[PDB]
Amino acid sequence: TKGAIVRWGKRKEKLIEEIRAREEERNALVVRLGEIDRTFAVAREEFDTVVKELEEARKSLYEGEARIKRAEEEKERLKAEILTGEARLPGLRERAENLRRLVEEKRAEISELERRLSSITSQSFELRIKLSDLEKELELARKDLEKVLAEERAVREEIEVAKRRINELDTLIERERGELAKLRGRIERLERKRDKLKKALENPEARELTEKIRAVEKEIAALREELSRVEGKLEGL
């Protein structure tokens, strides 16, 4: 009927309008999601980079700590060498003083006994034997003194060398520690950037829009099905 043409026609125009509005909304949603997915591409590449760099930094940190431990074990060996050397020095200096004194003593004894041989000159032969014995003893005392003095000089030298090497090691350790502090800063900055990247990657509005787009598309489908029935009605009326 004419009246049914009018009524169904009014229904048709309403359906067309509502479909137009729903498809408008749906396109907007699709655009927004099309920006989110791009942001996730960018962020996921940066995240991959940053966790890589973070691995590199942690490896460098461990290696630096290991080099420091090696340097400090070497430092402790050298400290023990120095303490061992230093504990010998009072004894060596005592020996040297006593040997200088013994040397002077023997020289004076040789002078006195030579004086008696001078004054007397039968049993001066005994004094002459005593003389050669005093000469052997003085000679030995002098050779011992040379040996003690040389050994004290050698111990002092070896102490100085160990101390210089220890200073060297402390400078190496200071350099490593400076690098470790720089790496701890780099790691803190990387960890923070990485946590922000993860948080952006759990945003999670991407799914908030995927489900909503599913719904609005379902409703568009429903409206188009009613529209198709209404059209088929008007096309046979």
Author numbering: 345 to 465, 696 to 811
What sentences appear in the manuscript?
Multi-subunit SMC complexes control chromosome superstructure and promote chromosome disjunction, conceivably by actively translocating along DNA double helices. SMC subunits comprise an ABC ATPase “head” and a “hinge” dimerization domain connected by a 49 nm coiled-coil “arm. The heads undergo ATP-dependent engagement and disengagement to drive SMC action on the chromosome. Here, we elucidate the architecture of prokaryotic Smc dimers by high-throughput cysteine cross-linking and crystallography.
To do so, we first determined the structure of the upper region of the Py Smc coiled coil, designated as PySmcCC3, comprising residues 345–468 and 694–814 connected via a SGGS linker. The structure refined to 2 Å resolution showed that, while the N-terminal α helix is continuous, the C-terminal helix contains a short non-helical region. This region (residues 774–779) exhibits barely traceable electron densities, and the opposing portion of the N-terminal helix displays better, but weak, electron densities. Helical wheel analysis and sequence alignment indicate that the non-helical region in Py Smc arises from a 2 aa deletion in comparison with other Smc protein, e.g., Bs Smc, which completes a heptad repeat in this region (right). In addition, the N-terminal helix bends noticeably at residue P434, which is unlikely to bear functional importance since P434 is not a conserved residue.
